[PDB]
């Protein structure tokens, strides 16, 4: 049978800043105990590039090997569409596997963004969630957070995006806090990042109406 | 390489309503022009039955073969937790494929339903978001609908159910209405089927205020 190759893209928000470090990640299971040192080739649009860190093999509890190379790539490339390819092989031996990864192709679109209060029925409980509604977008690789008084917040989760009937994708995101909080007007803020956004990045806040 | 074999539990509505006919379903591709009768086995916990529903095989668009096999299941062995599994042979030859599905353990918890508005700040435009939050549910088998005046409101996407930081389940719902028809005051209605319901339903109401 022999290894499985898998290629995995960078994290959308690292994307997005070019302080944060994108990553494409090239990982090889099912290396067997006697299979020679496993190498990676890696390249830009199919030039060679050797800035690679391809950490020692690591034994799985199915009695296999894992090997991982992880290529820093350049904001600018990876938007811009550039594919990047991996090419994994035995050393000493002549057979390799390839896989190839880019973004999504087609023309981007820009999240709207769109914060809804709490159901007047979920005001009886103890806590009540916040949502965060963001249409329209695409490609779908986006990154949602929230937060107040300038601190992030801990308690939300966010579904995957979802593709809607014009190509686009929505998703929501899910913000749960004390009641109390609410009450008391504290202001709460969902943060978006997509690279069709004016520089990557907006803010939408909400808190208890007048 | 050889077939693959997927098995589907039934679909969620199927199970919570005696007067519908829940089923679990195997399903063989990658069979090959010259693969000898495709078999299913299925058992109940460990027993084997015989009221599966087997199709002749089917050819693909990719030159390859497909067959399905439907097995009627009770509504309570589902919800009580009971192990399907399908074996998967070929007539005269040894080899097989076994799968096996069921119910997801631990204690069913009610969705909280709730009906969310439009933003204001969407109301600038011809079409309208109407919201429906559902919460705090397991296991993840659920149906979600919408409707209005007693019709069946086509125009909605709802997300996967995803799995929250206590164990239990949320998604989101979303209708897209005319702006329009949201201002003349009709009322909308989501709609849920989750086991952990009375009467395994509930449906909450949404219009303007
Ligand atoms: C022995 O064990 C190893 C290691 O497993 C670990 O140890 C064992 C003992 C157990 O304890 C495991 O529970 C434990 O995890 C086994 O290695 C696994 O091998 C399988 C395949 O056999 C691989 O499956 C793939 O998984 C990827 C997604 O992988 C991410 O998500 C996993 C959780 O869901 C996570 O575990 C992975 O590590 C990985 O996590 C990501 O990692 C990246 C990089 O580090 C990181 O940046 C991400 O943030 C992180 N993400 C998350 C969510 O955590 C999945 O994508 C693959 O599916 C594709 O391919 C399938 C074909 O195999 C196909 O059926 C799918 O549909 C899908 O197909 C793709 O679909 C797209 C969309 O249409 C299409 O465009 C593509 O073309 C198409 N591609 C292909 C090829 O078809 C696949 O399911 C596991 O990743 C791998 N685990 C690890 C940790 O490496 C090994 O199998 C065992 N061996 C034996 C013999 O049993
Ligand atoms: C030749 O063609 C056939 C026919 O395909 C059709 O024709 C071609 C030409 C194309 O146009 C196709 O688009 C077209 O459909 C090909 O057959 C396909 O083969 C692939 C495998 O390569 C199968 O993929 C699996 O899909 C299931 C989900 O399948 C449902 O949803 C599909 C839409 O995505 C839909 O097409 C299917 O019909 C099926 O629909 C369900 O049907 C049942 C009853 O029929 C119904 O009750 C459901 O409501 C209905 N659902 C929907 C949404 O409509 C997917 O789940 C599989 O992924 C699992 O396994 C992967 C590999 O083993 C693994 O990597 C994944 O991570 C995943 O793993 C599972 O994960 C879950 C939780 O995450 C876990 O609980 C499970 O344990 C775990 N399982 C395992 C084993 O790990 C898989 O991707 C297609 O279904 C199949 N299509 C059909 C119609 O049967 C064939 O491949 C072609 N041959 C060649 C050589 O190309």
């Avoid at 990640?25 to 040192?37: G, I, L, N, R």
């Avoid at 035995?90 to 999504?104: D, M, Q, R, V």
Wanted: glycine share 4%; aromatic share 10%.
């Amino acid at each position: 049978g022999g290894p499985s190759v898998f290629l995995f893209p960078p994290k959308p928000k690292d994307t997005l800043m070019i302080s944060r470090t994108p990553e494409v990640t090239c990982v090889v299971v099912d290396v067997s105990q006697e299979d020679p040192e496993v190498q990676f080739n890696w390249y830009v649009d199919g030039v060679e590039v050797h800035n690679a860190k391809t950490k020692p093999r690591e034994e799985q509890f199915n009695s296999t090997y894992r090997v991982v190379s992880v290529l820093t790539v350049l904001h600018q490339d990876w938007l811009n569409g550039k594919e990047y390819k991996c090419k994994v092989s035995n050393k000493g031996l002549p057979s390799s596997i390839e896989k190839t990864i880019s973004k999504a192709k087609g023309q981007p679109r820009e999240p709207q963004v769109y914060t809804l209060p709490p159901s007047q029925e979920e005001m009886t409980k103890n806590q009540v969630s916040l949502t965060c509604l963001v249409k329209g977008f695409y490609p779908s690789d986006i990154a949602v957070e929230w937060e107040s008084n300038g601190q992030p917040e801990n308690n939300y989760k966010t579904t995957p995006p979802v593709l809607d009937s014009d190509g686009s994708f929505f998703l929501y995101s899910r913000l749960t806090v004390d009641k109390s909080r609410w009450q008391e007007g504290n202001v709460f803020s969902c943060s978006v990042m997509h690279e069709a956004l004016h520089n990557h990045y907006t803010q939408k806040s909400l808190s208890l109406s007048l």
